[PDB]
Amino acid sequence: SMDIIFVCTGNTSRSPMAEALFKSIAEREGLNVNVRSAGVFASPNGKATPHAVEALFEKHIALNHVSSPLTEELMESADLVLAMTHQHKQIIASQFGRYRDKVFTLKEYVTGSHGDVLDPFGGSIDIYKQTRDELEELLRQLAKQLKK
């Protein structure tokens, strides 16, 4: 049981979308994983943002999410910590330097190239769908790679 945690700042849009998309993908691929998300600056009271929920609902995936701060406990239990952006990775490694060797951006880990997941902040539902689609492409490739 590999423990994966997707991380962004607020844990209301990209990282919870990644978590829900990847849970679905991994199950269909027969990959045994425990999947979570958290935010380096998250409030504990938050929900996923309406457009994030709707974007996944379109694809018949439920995004029923409560935002969670990234903690030492989560970092200790993780096998991989996949950041949405390279600044998220920097922030994580600053706070949790002992666990640097678990932390990568999603794009560098899967594709080998530096890059940040498309930010849907302030966007219409269609921008959120673009982020969803980019995440799905990355996460389908992640599932294939982790099964090795």
Residue 76: helix, strand or coil by DSSP? helix
Taking the CA atoms of residue 58, residue 147, residue 16 and residue 8 in that order, the dihedral angle to the nearest 10 degrees is -140
| Other CB atoms within 10 A of residue 117 CB | 24
Taking the CA atoms of residue 86, residue 88, residue 90 and residue 96 in that order, the dihedral angle to the nearest 10 degrees is -140
Structure tokens, 90: 């920097």
Which domains can be identified in the chain, with CATH numbers? 1-148 (3.40.50.2300)
Nearest to 132 by CA among 11, 10, 22: 22
14 is catalytic: yes
Q: How far apart are CA 65 and CA 47, in angstroms?
A: 6
Beta carbons of 120 and 127 less than 8 angstroms apart:
yes
Residue bearing tokens 């539902």: 125
Resolution stated for this PDB structure, in Å: 1.1
Structure tokens, 142: 């992640």
Structure tokens, 107: 């794009």
Catalytic residue among 3, 79, 101, 119, which? 119
Q: How far apart are CA 131 and CA 55, in angstroms?
A: 9
Taking the CA atoms of residue 109, residue 147, residue 79 and residue 5 in that order, the dihedral angle to the nearest 10 degrees is 70
28 is catalytic: no
Tell me how the structure was determined. X-ray
Which residue type is seen at 9?
A: T
Residue 66's DSSP bridge partners are 47
Nearest to 138 by CA among 105, 106, 116, 103: 106
Residue 39's DSSP bridge partners are 8, 69
Strands 103-105 and 33-39 turn out to be unpaired
100 is catalytic: no
